[PDB]
Amino acid sequence: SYTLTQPPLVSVALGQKATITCSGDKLSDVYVHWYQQKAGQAPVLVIYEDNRRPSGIPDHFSGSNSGNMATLTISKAQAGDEADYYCQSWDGTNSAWVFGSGTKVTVLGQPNAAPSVTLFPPSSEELKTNQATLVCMINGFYPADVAVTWEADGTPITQGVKTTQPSKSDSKYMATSYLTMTADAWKSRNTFICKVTHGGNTVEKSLSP
Amino acid sequence: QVQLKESGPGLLQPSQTLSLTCTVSGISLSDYGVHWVRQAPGKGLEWMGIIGHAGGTDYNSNLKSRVSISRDTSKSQVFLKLNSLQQEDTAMYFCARHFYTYFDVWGQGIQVTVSSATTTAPSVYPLAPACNTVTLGCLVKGYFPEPVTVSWNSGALTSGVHTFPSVLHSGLYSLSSSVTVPSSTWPSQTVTCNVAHPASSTKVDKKIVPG
């Protein structure tokens, strides 16, 4: 049951060194390989056998494998280098190929912008169905990673929640979070809140029936 | 020259058995093995198995007892089968060449969804603000399958629009759209949104109004 540990995210301003690290038991015994993957596309072999390039790949990728850490270097990062990156290896113990947990390398190319939140109440038209859907819409933020929390009368609300993944609009990212529930379990409560976290900033919007 | 393509269905239910053919060209299967790998939405790449150049096979432990790989070397076809399906089998499926330890050439990928959902037309609901420019919205709730077109005043509202990605729970999809309008225009001029769902043959207009 071999598993390769990989840090999930790696921010880096354009033209800086990005380092992604892959861990294992005796990772230097076996060869490591790295694949780049851009949203909705097949992986591409960027590095193989620890520190080797296939033809066609840029010279600004560079790998190494010592101790128990494999590492993929991106020197002088660019907009087109941003992607999900995956390390990989073989293991004899049980004949199988094992993939790393993946490192989403984000290449920052503009100021980090705060989100604009809008929290909509349920519609009369929906409430006649005896249902209630709150819509917390998040706009104009960068980079593309937010964290949403819901809270009713000051007690964290998890169940019934679902959030879209981020998605690029014009120049910045956008996302929504929904809270689904019964029509009267909305009318009962005093106040609802969606908390949208981004960077080291929280933005809050209230909604009280 | 050396290319791999995936073919097969993109919509199954938790009963059926999946069947994907990976078609090779440029090279011969007689002297190359082919891997299969999948990837659940926003999750890691998982190796499922391999069928070598010799015809020997080798599968993953967590997949085993319900996964089969075979081929047809004349047509250069490589086959994959997953019986006993569920929601969490839904993923992008890739086929990739074996070359020593690494995977040098990959397919483009084929999305597959496992879902017992039937073609349901959405419920469109308006979204007026709850008490220098205003933003309104349309909630397309509970539909299947994708996609769903969302417009505003039949294309007359191009600027200020924002269509967000669809989200899914208990089978059906949900999706919302919005329009920032100059504060003066609304509500002196009306704003309707136009939702289309070609799968359910449904076109539904909905005026957004103060409450």
Author numbering:
A (entry chain L): 1 to 9, 11 to 95, 95A, 95B, 96 to 106, 106A, 107 to 166, 168, ...
B (entry chain H): 1 to 82, 82A, 82B, 82C, 83 to 128, 136 to 154, 156 to 157, 162 to 169, ...
Q: From the publication, what sentences describe this entry?
A:
Binding of one of those antibodies, HL4E10, to epithelial γδ T cell surface-expressed JAML (Junctional Adhesion Molecule-Like) receptor leads to potent costimulation via phosphoinsositide-3-kinase recruitment, activation of Akt and MAP kinase pathways, and cytokine production, ultimately resulting in epithelial γδ T cell proliferation. Here, we report the first crystal structure of a hamster IgG Fab fragment and the complete cDNA sequence of the stimulatory antibody HL4E10 which contains the first example of a hamster lambda light chain. The primary structure of HL4E10 is the first example of a hamster lambda light chain sequence, and its heavy chain sequence is only the second known complete hamster heavy chain sequence. The binding of HL4E10 to γδ T cell-expressed JAML induces potent costimulation and ultimately cell proliferation, suggesting that humanized HL4E10 derivatives, might be useful therapeutic tools for treatment of γδ T cell dysfunction-associated diseases, such as chronic non-healing wounds or cancer.
The crystal structure of the hamster HL4E10 Fab resembles that of a typical Fab. The two HL4E10 Fab molecules (chains LH and AB) in the asymmetric unit do not significantly differ from each other in their overall structure or in the conformation of the combining site. The elbow angles between the variable and constant domains are 193.5° and 189.5° for chains LH and AB, respectively. The HL4E10 combining site is composed of a relatively flat central area (formed by ValL31, ThrH98, TrpL96, IleH50, HisH95, and PheH96), surrounded by more protruding residues (AspH31, TyrH32 of CDR H1; HisH53-AspH58 of CDR H2; AspL30, TyrL32 of CDR L1; ArgL53 of CDR L2; and TrpL91 and SerL95A of CDR L3). A number of aromatic residues, i.e. three tyrosines (TyrL32, TyrH32, TyrH97), one phenylalanine (PheH96), two tryptophans (TrpL91, TrpL96), and two histidines (HisH35, HisH95); and two aliphatic residues (ValL31, IleH50) render the center of the HL4E10 combining site rather hydrophobic in nature. The side chains of two residues, namely TyrL32 and TyrH97, rise significantly above the central plain of the combining site, but do not exhibit any significant differences when comparing both HL4E10 molecules in the asymmetric unit, suggesting that the HL4E10 combining site is mostly rigid and structurally optimized for ligand binding. The rigid arrangement of the HL4E10 CDR loops is maintained by an extensive network of hydrophobic stacking and CH-π interactions, and is further stabilized by H-bonds between different CDR loops, as well as between CDR loops and framework residues. In the CDR H3, 5 out of 6 consecutive residues have large, aromatic side chains (HisH95, PheH96, TyrH97, TyrH99, PheH100) and are tightly packed between the CDR H1, L1, L2, and L3 loops, thus constricting any significant motion.
